[PDB]
């Protein structure tokens, strides 16, 4: 609850003691109760498995990846999200991989990822339609709702305050080096206005 | 007892490329273009600029001392023009006439399996 992705309680035999360990994954789209999950360097190539990235060939899709292997998952965790293996530097074993945001990172090829995409994707397409349907979304996240715009407040409350009209008054873009108290608006905005396009940087 | 090279010549319009490699090419040596031995832009692919291009290139054959070369003429190709530019058969008969000894020519203009729609629009270049 609170998360748009579905979880997956998976259990393993503890190899140093007679008991079981229930590790909690984020379910990739396609895994199901009763499925067998393989977890290691020599694990094979099917969705749901979790492998070091030097193993999987150029072009795989993985998720909940580690920036430093052993951090137990930091990337591509949201519903419908994933990353792509794009290249291997084998000597100095690091793998370059492209992310949801379009960025490209180079992470130690020993990093563990989970084959496939995170389940529950497509959640954002349906409108919320009812203000209360958002009240309920955020009642299981945090007190981040609703936002009242600064231009409605008095100047004692917000740099966008005051005025006999409702105007920001001065440029709403703030330079990254502003001090906390000032950073209300479009911080370090390298542009503004209407785009048309998308990512893949260089 | 003679060694060879790889000419990878690229005879476009508006320019002419002569560029000799190792048979690998991961190490290659001293390109000259068609615009380095003349500066006009309306005279960049002219045969007179292809002779000048083979001149300062073969002259750099024995820069650490080698002799001979193989040839690969390639026009613009790809999606565009598929036919050798002007300074092609000029820049070759130059280094033939320039004592460097050659043989085994091939045409490696990249020709598609009819793909990737081409510049110019549907009514063409209307001049």
């Amino acid at each position: 609850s609170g998360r748009g992705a579905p979880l997956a309680k998976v259990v393993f035999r503890d190899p140093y003691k007679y008991r079981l360990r229930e590790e909690i994954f984020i379910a990739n789209e396609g895994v199901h109760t009763g499925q067998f999950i393989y977890a290691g360097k020599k694990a094979s190539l099917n969705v749901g498995n979790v492998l070091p990235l030097g193993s999987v060939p150029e072009g795989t899709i993985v998720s909940n990846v580690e920036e430093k292997p052993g951090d137990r998952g930091a990337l591509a965790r949201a519903s419908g999200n994933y990353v792509i293996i794009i290249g291997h530097n084998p000597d100095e074993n690091k793998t370059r991989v492209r992310l949801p945001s379009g960025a490209k990172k180079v992470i130690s090829s020993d990093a563990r990822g989970v084959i496939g995409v995170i389940a529950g994707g497509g959640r954002v397409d349906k409108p919320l339609l009812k203000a209360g349907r958002a009240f309920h979304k955020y009642r299981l996240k945090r007190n981040s709702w609703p936002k009242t715009r600064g231009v409605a407040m008095n100047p004692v409350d917000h740099p966008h305050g005051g005025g006999n009209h409702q105007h920001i008054g001065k440029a709403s873009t703030i330079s990254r080096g502003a001090v906390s108290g000032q950073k209300a608006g479009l911080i370090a905005a390298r542009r503004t206005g209407l785009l048309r396009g998308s990512q893949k940087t260089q | 007892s003679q060694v060879f090279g790889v000419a990878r010549i690229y005879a476009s319009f508006n320019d002419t490329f002569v560029h000799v490699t190792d048979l690998s090419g991961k190490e290659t040596i001293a390109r000259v273009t068609g615009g380095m031995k003349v500066k006009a832009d309306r005279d960049e692919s002219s045969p007179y600029a292809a002779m000048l291009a083979a001149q300062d290139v073969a002259a750099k054959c024995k820069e650490v001392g080698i002799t001979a070369v193989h040839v690969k003429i390639r026009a613009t190709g790809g999606t565009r023009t598929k036919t050798p530019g002007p300074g092609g058969q000029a820049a070759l008969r130059a280094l033939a006439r320039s004592g460097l000894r050659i043989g085994r020519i091939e045409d490696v203009t990249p020709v598609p399996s009819d793909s990737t729609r081409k510049k110019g629009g549907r009514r063409g270049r209307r001049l």
Partner: protein, 91 residues
């Protein structure tokens, strides 16, 4: 007989929210509430619980999927893609 000429399941929302959001909400209100087939059980009896969680009513076998469909376009191709790459690694 026929109750709504166009509004179907979104008839609950009345006239509120604007004709086009109800039509977007509609499309996925159907997918979300549709009964699907079970890959293992064969029986057309899997429908969604929470988002991305799809349980066959009998046979009780749960699988993860899209938030509103049992299977997305993306997963179906990435499934047909690692299986593409898997086949050169194994052979």
């Amino acid at each position: 007989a026929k109750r709504t000429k166009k509004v179907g399941i979104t008839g609950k929302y009345g006239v509120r929210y604007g004709s086009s959001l109800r039509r977007q909400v509609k499309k996925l209100e159907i997918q979300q509430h549709a009964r699907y087939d079970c890959s293992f059980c064969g029986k057309k009896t899997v429908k969604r619980g929470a988002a991305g969680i799809w349980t066959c009513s009998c046979c009780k076998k749960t699988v993860a999927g899209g938030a509103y469909t049992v299977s997305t376009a993306a997963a179906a191709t990435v499934r047909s893609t690692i299986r593409r790459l898997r086949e050169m690694v194994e052979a």
